[PDB]
């Protein structure tokens, strides 16, 4: 069914967004493991798959629209070396893509493309539930202190 | 444990080899799933899930071998617009990876990095295993025409 | 128990039967397999086993007889290059053995070895049963043609 | 997937072994029963068995590699006349046939097939452990004397 | 349904076969087991429910053939004082047996009494197991010893 | 069967590693339960095991290869009084096995003993992992310093 | 708890005693079960784990009383190499531990370590279980003689 061409370019780029946080919350998953730090690991790695059904949702919508898929472009990770580092990187990211959403949740209403800004309207919530974690773990190394934090984060949970 | 540079740069190139099967086999999965070929979305998902765990694999090995893993650089893909140009196009990156694979399994061997060596023949026994099908599948596309071929798709195996 | 030494010939003969087809069935199982034309391996594969069943019982029966069992001497394979071509030798496999079954049978009649020919009618009922596949498979390309003959081996059964 | 032309005829060699094997040690196996030496049975008919699977690996993977298996060929088999005979035939067959896949499985890894190198390897192990059961019976037979040895055969384990 | 006089006669002669070896079998198990050994108790008490079934078949197959069952004309026994004597007293009654069976199974088929021809071959199966049993049982004795054999019996299998 | 002799040497050589490794690690486990540090006791106890494991199969390859294991000959353990110089030591010690394994790994080869070199990779990965566990601690008491690290030990995981 | 220097060199000399005894029992162990004798290679592998047990008695013991556990000095293995060498082999072991706990047990009731000795106690128990063992084996192997003896080894009981 013949989509809106901005809308697919939309789409296109928040995969684009999605599949750049794929990439790093999985690396940083597993640096996070290699660290011992098994509760980060976990959280990580679901993020990562979270982010995964993101960028399956988009594709089949870009493709049920008639338009092409883009997972050949790989935008800029940003890795980083510790802990803070790290998740400070991903809430960058994620607020990125947010502002992205947003932007394109509107225009998808202007052009009544209803199915597409309720998918997205879901992926938005997801994202600041995301963000939630991140600014809250964020706080939570100022409060106890980075080594009191590292303690808390060896077992599962 | 430091590990061989050699060996992770391999790691590191064999690692991008799976991160272009990943997406180019999870689009076109999705691409015959909008086609309505069920069966073909079926298997090509879950080769690109294999390929995923390969991913897992050499990540988490470089990590121990305390080098970076490279999830940046993305090479080329090759999507293609009907089912038997797709399927060319995911066997030819099959036999690309593969010799890949034999190259960094012999110099692995040379630098006595056993552990790295006997995980990437594991992988090659896998990589051979897509081989079989896409080679398989191609053939029977010969001997059964397209037509045919298509309707064998349909339903789920 | 002292068989009959012509018994005991026959019984050999009809063993030295059983292994080549045995054999040239086993490998057209694989080849069909590997063309993922799955119901003709399932198929083959378990008329190789019946077969290997029939040289178990001959096998046993000469041994009880104080024979020697004669494993070998093997005898011609016809393994074919294409479908038809390999049911129509292992039709001509099973139409040349049911003949010497019918001999034997009739000779173990005359000099009273009773037991032999109640195994060997077995084994000459199963034969039939596997010529009456084999002549249906051939009659069923003829009907609806090689392409759809061939998709319809595809999925097992 | 097309294999080294050297490794394919390695692979025929060892198939040729393998089926020298499965109908010397089901001959035997059915020799022992006949004689009521029931755990002989059991554990010959399963070393038949063995060979069995041993020879499909052969056969899939020259397949695979788009050679031709040749099951036409048949070596020398010594059948023997008494335990002791029998099972040292047995033994001499395991220890040639280990001497060529010794041979096959370094010239795999020279020419980089290193899965057809993994599967002849798993086989060599299948094969060191019949040499160990061969070797140690041999033995018994001394230390405990034929007579005893013998008894010790008449009850399955 | 009045069937040949002269089948009738020889039911008659094989019920009095029978008999003999009811009661010749029974004994024997009853030696064995008052001599503690089990395992010839068990084997040679089945032996005779064996050959009390085979009675049943002939008397209800002369019953209905119109004709007199002879259960009165008892024949000799030949009961024997050890083991060895013992068994193979056995396996002469059997090879015997083994002859008129034949004899009669020819007889039947001429006359077109199928059904009575039939049912003498299963029973000449089962006497031919038996045979294979004694035979077997003999040149054990042989190639352990008496002693040893002996051992062997002491306990149920 | 006829080991080479040199083969035999190596297994006996990893053979003293692991037997020192077993007691070390089990001293220090029982260190650790005497401390408190319930998780390192139960861990390090593992680890113990899995050297026992590891010993076992040496000693039975080498009595397959009609070699004589040495268990008489202990080589140098280091104690340590502290749970860093604990770890430390054990590192030092799977640092030094990796290496023997190594060199052993490339001989065996070299004399075609290739399933005592597959016996000796999957050892070796075993060891891998232990290494990495070790040095993940050791890293884990420098983040976040002796006494946190000291009362994440005290539970069971 | 601050124990006793001279008991916690009992506690030593007694831990040394075990440690001999595991290597010994554990090889002997692997002897038989590689000459096929499966039922001595059960019990001595079990009397190997309950000096293991033991040997963590003692350790746990000495470092609860305050002393060093020494795993470093390994006391004379005397292996041997037919079947009642070994096991007269491990008598000897055996009756030199026992006496070498009677002397401890009277040591420690005499400076009061109550608990240190009825641990003891109850370790004599065990090993004086393992001299009736092995005192009725090499009994059994005078009465039956050693073909009748090995045999009686062959299967698990
Ligand atoms: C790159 C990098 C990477 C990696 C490493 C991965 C990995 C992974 C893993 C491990 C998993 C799990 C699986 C199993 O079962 O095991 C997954 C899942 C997954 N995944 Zn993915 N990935 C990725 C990318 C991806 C992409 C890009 C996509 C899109 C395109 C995806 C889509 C996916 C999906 C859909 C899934 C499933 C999910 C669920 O859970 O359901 N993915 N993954
Ligand atoms: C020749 C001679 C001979 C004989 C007698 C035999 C016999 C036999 C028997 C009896 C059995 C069982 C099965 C049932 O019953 O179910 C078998 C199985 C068998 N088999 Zn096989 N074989 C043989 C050869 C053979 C060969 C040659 C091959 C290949 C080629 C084979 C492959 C086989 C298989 C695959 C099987 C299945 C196994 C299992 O179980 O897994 N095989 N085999
Ligand atoms: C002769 C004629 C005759 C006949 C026909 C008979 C027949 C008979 C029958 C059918 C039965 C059932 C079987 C089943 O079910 O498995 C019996 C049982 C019988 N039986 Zn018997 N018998 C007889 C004689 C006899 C004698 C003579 C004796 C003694 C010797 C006997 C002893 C007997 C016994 C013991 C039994 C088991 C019983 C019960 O129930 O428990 N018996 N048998
Ligand atoms: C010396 C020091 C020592 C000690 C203290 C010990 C102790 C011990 C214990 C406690 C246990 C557990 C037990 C139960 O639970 O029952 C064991 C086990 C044990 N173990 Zn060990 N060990 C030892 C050495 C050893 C050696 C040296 C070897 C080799 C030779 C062994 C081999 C062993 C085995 C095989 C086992 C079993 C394992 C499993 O888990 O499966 N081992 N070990
Ligand atoms: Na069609
Ligand atoms: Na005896
Ligand atoms: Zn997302
Ligand atoms: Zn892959
Ligand atoms: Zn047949
Ligand atoms: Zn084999
Ligand atoms: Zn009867
Ligand atoms: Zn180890
Ligand atoms: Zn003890």
């Given at each position: 069914?013949?989509?809106?061409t901005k ?51 988009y594709i ?98």
């Amino acid at each position: 069914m013949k989509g809106d061409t901005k809308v697919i370019n939309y789409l296109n780029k928040l995969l684009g967004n999605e599949l750049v946080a794929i990439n790093q919350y999985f690396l940083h998953a597993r640096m996070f493991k290699n660290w011992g730090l098994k509760r980060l690991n976990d959280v990580e790695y679901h993020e990562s798959i979270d982010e995964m059904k993101h960028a399956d949702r988009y594709i089949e919508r870009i493709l049920f629209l008639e338009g092409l898929p883009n997972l050949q472009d790989l935008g800029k990770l940003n890795i980083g070396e510790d802990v803070e580092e790290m998740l400070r990187s991903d809430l960058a990211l994620e607020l990125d893509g947010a502002k992205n959403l947003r932007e394109a949740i509107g225009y998808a209403d202007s052009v009544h493309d209803y199915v597409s800004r309720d998918m997205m309207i879901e992926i938005l919530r997801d994202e600041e539930g995301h963000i939630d974690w991140l600014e809250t773990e964020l706080d939570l190394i100022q409060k106890m202190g980075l080594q009191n934090y590292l303690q808390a984060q060896i077992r599962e949970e």
